[PDB]
């Protein structure tokens, strides 16, 4: 469960992320693939090399989904229903991989926004990403 | 922990540029803030209510220094982590009753702190090498 | 996130549990203490022997809390605000212990209600106990 | 895994009354139902949509029989679990890419299945002995 303070923290952090969302998501996906190779088994049709156009496009899609989730934080299960159906019913992704991707997103945000990554913002983003992972993994 | 020679060289070069006194304290404080149930083990450190009070705690800073010293000792003995972290594993399991997942949590927080400090220098390959290092360290403490 | 199907399954299962809730909770606590001794550190003032009145009373309290959570399944986050305050801010319990207690409750229900413990009911109760644990571990 | 003589006697006595074909498939099917992300590994089995289809699958029953055979082999070698499950650990870690948490989940599901089958005689001491047995088995597979 998210508090209003952490909700405001996440909103401000992703608002200042802004237009670099696609690059940040692509870098997070690249970090996940490099440091947790078992996550590569979910993308057997993808080109998982550095600078891949497929990885860049998927990172842009993930970043857009995260922006939508931020804009609809109070109704996440109803805003991420399509992604929940995709990840839970069709892809059947292990939630451990969601944890790994959330950590890689946190690492990317820390590396690209040193000033905004205060401990409070780090905790708020951790809780926000945990909530997002919960909805996508759950089937309802 | 098995690392390539290039990965080991990269890990060591970043580690030399690491400010131990700040990095260990920041990692411990960020762990205590992001995962508040970990303050049960550190209630003896004084005021840990707000994040600013957690990060401004000399006891937290000193304990983070000790933790990062243990991390450096493990880094110097990457081939004997299990034997190096035997006393610490006994202390954390038999006497402190720390769940093994908290070791992985602290390792991830340390990786995030390193990324925060180094920025572009924390490339994805360096992060992968450090992830292998911290996963090996966490397992040795869990043993 | 729970669905109407597993919500109804949990409601029916707890209705079948009925008045044996106190003894079921006491037995679940005894199982958790016996099989996961690290959970005993959260009760240093308790007498944790077999057949203890303190453990019986705490099991009754836990069972009543679970009953009210079932009764307020759609509004659990604010229906369990006092318990979230107690466990998250004051006691600071590791969510691993909540996982262990949920497993022990599932084992107790399996042992005491064989016919009612179908795989669907098992999955429904697992998901319901995961959500109750998340509300009581979340800090808002 | 270190067990007391009483715990070993209770574990063996309870396992003597286990029906190998029924309990194994039931545990595997309950795993596939309660944790639906585990059907990604068993898509080749066929229809796994409804709980009744998961629990009425001959391939699921046969694989549960194999899993319980492995569990019995581990029980017969409680002092050599790491060496007993070396080939299975290699198979699950390299060729199947199964997360180590799923081993703990399957062990807990098996404990729930044993409680379901035995009822009152699945006492808390017997459950504790089986809990540490399945914990040791899962730790061997994760290795
Ligand atoms: C916060 C976490 C995540 C978010 C916001 C997210 C978001 C998305 C989005 C927006 C898509 C595009 C769907 C489409 O274009 O049809 C997608 C697809 C997909 N996701 Fe995720 N995802 C997350 C986590 C994960 C993880 C951790 C994995 C695997 C380890 C994963 C595996 C996939 C796969 C395989 C696809 C299919 C893409 C394709 O086939 O081109 N997702 N996800
Ligand atoms: C990679 C992970 C970890 C490492 C390398 C590590 C290392 C250390 C070191 C070097 C000490 C000092 C021992 C001494 O001075 O004799 C220590 C003590 C301690 N550790 Fe850790 N630790 C880790 C994880 C954790 C975590 C995650 C927690 C809690 C959630 C924890 C709780 C404690 C406590 C409470 C003490 C004693 C502090 C005191 O008594 O003031 N440890 N650890
Ligand atoms: C999983 C579902 C749980 C429920 C429904 C629950 C519910 C409750 C209730 C109703 C109380 C009494 C509140 C009062 O007396 O004012 C309580 C107290 C307490 N709970 Fe829980 N609890 C759960 C999990 C846990 C777990 C897993 C632990 C520790 C491993 C724990 C540790 C405690 C402690 C230490 C107390 C204080 C007892 C006392 O002061 O006498 N709880 N809980
Ligand atoms: C936790 C204790 C476990 C035991 C004792 C066990 C035992 C076994 C054994 C003996 C085999 C050999 C089957 C054969 O050679 O045909 C096997 C294969 C397999 N296991 Fe496990 N297993 C465990 C956990 C898991 C879990 C949790 C999963 C998935 C979530 C899994 C996925 C598989 C798969 C996909 C196969 C191959 C099946 C096939 O090729 O038809 N295992 N396991």
Numbering used by the authors:
A (entry chain C), C (entry chain A): 1 to 140
B (entry chain D), D (entry chain B): 1 to 143
Original paper wording:
Here, we present a workflow that utilizes the SPT Labtech chameleon – a next-generation nanospray cryoEM grid preparation device – in an aerobic environment to freeze O2-sensitive proteins under functionally anaerobic conditions, which we term (an)aerobic. Demonstrating the utility of this workflow, we determined high-resolution cryoEM structures of deoxygenated human hemoglobin (Hb) in various liganded states and the molybdenum-iron protein (MoFeP) – the O2-sensitive catalytic component of Azotobacter vinelandii nitrogenase – in a reduced state. Our workflow maintains (an)aerobic samples by protecting against or eliminating O2 contamination prior to loading into the chameleon, during sample aspiration, and throughout sample deposition on self-wicking EM grids, respectively. Finally, we detail the effects of O2 contamination at different stages of the workflow and show how to prevent their effects. Together, we demonstrate reproducible high-resolution structure determination of O2-sensitive proteins of varying complexity and size – as small as 64 kDa – with a workflow requiring only minimal modifications to a robust, widely available EM grid freezing method.
As monitored by UV-Vis spectroscopy, metHb has a Soret maximum at 405 nm, indicating that the heme iron is in an oxidized state (Fe3+) and incapable of binding O2. Briefly, we created two metHb samples – one without and one with the protective oil layer – by placing 15 µL of metHb (~ 125 µM) each into two sample cups. One sample was used without modification (non-oiled), and ~ 70 µL of aerobic Al’s oil was carefully layered over the second sample up to the brim of the sample cup (oiled). We did not observe any noticeable differences neither in the quality of the sample stripes on the grids nor in their behavior during data collection. A comparison of our 2.78-Å resolution non-oiled and 2.71-Å resolution oiled metHb EM densities did not indicate any notable differences in their overall quality. Indeed, the view distribution and the total number of particles were similar between the samples, each resolved to a similar resolution and demonstrated similar map-to-model validation metrics.
